[PDB]
C-alpha cells in the first residue's frame, strides 16, 4: 500500500514511461546468436541503428547466454546508449532467454487479476501472452503496461485523463514466490535508468502463472 505517487515523478519521467510502454518499438527475435552481449547487424533498414547492445549486469550472467542460441524480447533505447558502433547502436536491459527446449506447443495466455480501489475488474485473456516455458519478467511487464496505458491512461497526465495515481504489478508464481514492481517507482527520467529494473535477467516459469494488478485513483 506504501506505493510511489504519479505526482512525485520527475520532469519528463511520465512522458518517457509512456514512450517505453506504449509507443517505442520492442526488440523481438527468435533463435539469434552473439557484462554485455553485442548483436551486430540486428536492425535492417532502420534509419537510426544497426546494432543492439544487451546489458546483463555481470560477466557470470553473460556467460550463460554468450555463444548460444538465444531469444530476445525487450524494450530498446538509443539516447545515452554506451557501446557498439557510435550513434548507430540501440541499448537493451535483459530480455534474454535460451532458445532450445523453451518453445510452447500452445500459446499461454497469462490471466490478470485487476483491482481498482479494491474493486475487482475483468481483463481479456489475450492481453498478456507468450510461447515460452521460462519467460523474462520484462516480456510480461511490457504487455501488461501497454494494456494499462491503452485502457486506463496509466502514463498520461491528470489533465489528459490519467486517473490512476498508484499501482503495483505482481507476477505471482505457482509455489508462492512473487516479483513485485511499483508502477510509479521511476529510476531517473530517461530510458537508460528507467529500464534498469530489467538489468537482472529475471526468468519465471509460465506454467500456472497469473498477474495480480492493484491500481489506485487516490
Amino acid at each position: 500500500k506504501d506505493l510511489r505517487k504519479k505526482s512525485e515523478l520527475q520532469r519528463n519521467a511520465l512522458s518517457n514511461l509512456r514512450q517505453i510502454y506504449y509507443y517505442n518499438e520492442k526488440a523481438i527475435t527468435e533463435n539469434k546468436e552473439s557484462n554485455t552481449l553485442l548483436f551486430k547487424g540486428f536492425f535492417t533498414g532502420h534509419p537510426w541503428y544497426n546494432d543492439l547492445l544487451v546489458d546483463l549486469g555481470s560477466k557470470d550472467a553473460t556467460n550463460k547466454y554468450k555463444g548460444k542460441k538465444v531469444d530476445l524480447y525487450g524494450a530498446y533505447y538509443g539516447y545515452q546508449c554506451a557501446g557498439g558502433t557510435p550513434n548507430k547502436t540501440a541499448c537493451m536491459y535483459g530480455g534474454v532467454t535460451l532458445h532450445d527446449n523453451n518453445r510452447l506447443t500452445e500459446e499461454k495466455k497469462v490471466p490478470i487479476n485487476l483491482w481498482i480501489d479494491g474493486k475487482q475488474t475483468t481483463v481479456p485473456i489475450d492481453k498478456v501472452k507468450t510461447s515460452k516455458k521460462e519467460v523474462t519478467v520484462q516480456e510480461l511487464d511490457l504487455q501488461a503496461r501497454h494494456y494499462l496505458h491503452g485502457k486506463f491512461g496509466l502514463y498520461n497526465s491528470d489533465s489528459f485523463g490519467g486517473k490512476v495515481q498508484r499501482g503495483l504489478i505482481v507476477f505471482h508464481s505457482s509455489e508462492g514466490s512473487t516479483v513485485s514492481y511499483d508502477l510509479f517507482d521511476a529510476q531517473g527520467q530517461y530510458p537508460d535508468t528507467l529500464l534498469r529494473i530489467y538489468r537482472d535477467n529475471k526468468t519465471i516459469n509460465s506454467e500456472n502463472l497469473h498477474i495480480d494488478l492493484y491500481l489506485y485513483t487516490t
Partner: T-cell receptor
Amino acid sequence: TGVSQNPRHKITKRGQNVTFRCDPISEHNRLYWYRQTLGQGPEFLTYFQNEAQLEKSRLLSDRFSAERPKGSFSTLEIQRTEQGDSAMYLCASSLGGYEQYFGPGTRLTVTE
Amino acid sequence: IQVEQSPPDLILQEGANSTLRCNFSDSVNNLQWFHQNPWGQLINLFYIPSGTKQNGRLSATTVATERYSLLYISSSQTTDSGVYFCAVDSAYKYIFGTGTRLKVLA
C-alpha cells in the same frame, strides 16, 4: 526542406482539443517543437532525442503533450485551447543537434 | 540565457550592403542564422558557433570571446526582404532573438 507538418492551417473553438503532426528527415535523431506568436521569434516548447523526451519548458504546460508514436513522426496535442494558444507551431529536426532543419509549420487560430 | 538582435527594423535600398548584429549573454557551442519568408518557412543560412563562413552574397562572422555574431548581406535584392533570426544553444534548449525585419526598397 525534408521536414513536413500537418495540418498547414487549423481553426478550433475555445476549449476544444487540437493535434499537430511533424514528419522529420528520417536520418535525424533529434526532434524539436517551437511556438511562434505574431511579430515575435520562435519560443522553445520541448525536444526529443531518439525515443526519449529530453527537455520541457514552462510554456509547455499540463494542457500540452508531445509524443513520438513510432517511428517516422511526432505529434503535439493541446487540450482546453485558449485564445492565447493562437500561434505558428514550428517543428525542427537535426542530426546532432548541429544544424536544425525547420518544417513549414502549423498556423493555429483559436476563436471564441 | 538572453539573446538580442540589432537593429530591430532595417530600411535598405536595392544593391546596397547591410550588417545584422546578434548579441548573446553566455558561451555558445552552437549558433545558427535563419531567414523567415512571408509563408513562415525558416531558411537555414549559416551554422556558425565561431569563425567566418560565406554562402555567395551572404557571409557570417562569430566572435565567440566577445559573445556576438554578425550577418552580412552584399548587394541586397528585393527577394532578401523578410525576418532574419539568430538562435543560440543554452550551454540543446535553443533561444531565438527578437529578430530583424529587412525592408529592401526598389
